[PDB]
Amino acid sequence: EKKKIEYLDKTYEVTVPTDKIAITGSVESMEDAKLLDVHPQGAISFSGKFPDMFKDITDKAEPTGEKMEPNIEKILEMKPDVILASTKFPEKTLQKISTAGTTIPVSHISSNWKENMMLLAQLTGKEKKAKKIIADYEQDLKETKTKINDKAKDSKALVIRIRQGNIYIYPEQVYFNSTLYGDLGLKAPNEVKAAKAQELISLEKLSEMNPDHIFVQFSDDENADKPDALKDLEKNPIWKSLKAVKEDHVYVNSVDPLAQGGTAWSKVRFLKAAAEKLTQNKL
Ligand SMILES: O=C(NCc1cc(CNC(=O)c2cccc(O)c2O)cc(CNC(=O)c2cccc(O)c2O)c1)c1cccc(O)c1O
Numbered sequence: 001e002k003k004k005i006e007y008l009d010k011t012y013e014v015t016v017p018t019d020k021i022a023i024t025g026s027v028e029s030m031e032d033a034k035l036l037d038v039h040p041q042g043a044i045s046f047s048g049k050f051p052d053m054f055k056d057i058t059d060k061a062e063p064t065g066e067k068m069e070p071n072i073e074k075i076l077e078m079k080p081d082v083i084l085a086s087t088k089f090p091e092k093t094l095q096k097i098s099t100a101g102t103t104i105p106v107s108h109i110s111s112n113w114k115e116n117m118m119l120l121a122q123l124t125g126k127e128k129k130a131k132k133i134i135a136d137y138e139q140d141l142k143e144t145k146t147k148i149n150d151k152a153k154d155s156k157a158l159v160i161r162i163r164q165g166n167i168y169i170y171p172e173q174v175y176f177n178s179t180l181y182g183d184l185g186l187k188a189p190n191e192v193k194a195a196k197a198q199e200l201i202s203l204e205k206l207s208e209m210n211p212d213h214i215f216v217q218f219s220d221d222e223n224a225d226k227p228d229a230l231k232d233l234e235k236n237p238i239w240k241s242l243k244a245v246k247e248d249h250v251y252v253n254s255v256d257p258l259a260q261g262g263t264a265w266s267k268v269r270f271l272k273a274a275a276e277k278l279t280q281n282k283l
């Protein structure tokens with residue numbers, strides 16, 4: 001018989017505790033697995049390979065495919081007890097994935113970082129480890145707020161992700177923004193308050209926003225269509241006009257560019273990075 005795992009208003013029947021976990025779409029769950037020492041059966045590949053930072057937990061895994069492109073033939077062959085999917089998949093892709101087994105769309109909304117973590121914990125029987133990781137972050141946070149200067153806290157700060165050579169911004173509770181604005185208390189700017197999903201933003205618009213600090217996240221595996229995007233930007237006269245640029249307050253990949261923002265592991269890293277960068281000295 002199985003157990004009833006409750007996950008964000010929904011309930012799922014899953015035989016737990018299981019090692020037979022297929023992760024597709026949800027890089028969030030990859031990051032949770034990493035801190036929980038969960039070694040899934042299926043894991044997400046990134047350009048066909050498993051990045052160094054995940055190798056400790058991908059040792060018993062085979063690919064479910066690239067992030068946005070689940071391999072149903074592979075996932076069926078695995079016959080998992082649970083498939084951890086993403087809330088970013090179209091519904092028709094979620095229904096198609098669910099032919100291979102019990103499927104839980106894991107939230108990409110960064111304010112659900114605790115629930116996502118506990119879900120994997122509940123599936124794997126590691127609630128103690130998951131509570132300890134969460135508690136530790138909260139202490140890390142309270143301790144880190146004290147180290148961050150007033151000026152920095154009242155500055156205009158942005159997180160951008162460059163994908164296929166375009167600039168994207170995100171809602172207030174998505175990506176790292178829940179840590180930059182929510183946890184550290186910096187004022188989210190209007191364009192971010194207005195964002196309802198991953199939203200394209202022009203350099204032209206950015207130059208009006210004129211942020212004090214810009215965290216730029218850039219992955220080659222997401223920029224194959226234009227690999228010079230970062231260097232071409234830095235040579236654009238509208239980018240060179242930015243306050244953040246001229247004052248040397250642009251931080252490229254302060255956290256690994258495959259980091260998703262809405263996880264314990266993303267939050268702890270961004271919190272330390274933001275702290276180092278905003279206060280201009282290593283903590
Ligand atoms: O099926 C998917 N996407 C269709 C889609 C494409 C788009 C247009 N997306 C892109 O061009 C894109 C390019 C490279 C990598 C991505 O993750 C992209 O979403 C938007 C959106 C809406 N997305 C968001 O709001 C979002 C928020 C935070 C982080 C994200 O990664 C988000 O996608 C959905 C998908 C599946 C797994 C993982 C994903 O990140 C996905 O975007």
Ligand SMILES: [Fe+3]
Nearest residue numbers: 067068088198
């Ligand atoms: Fe996406």
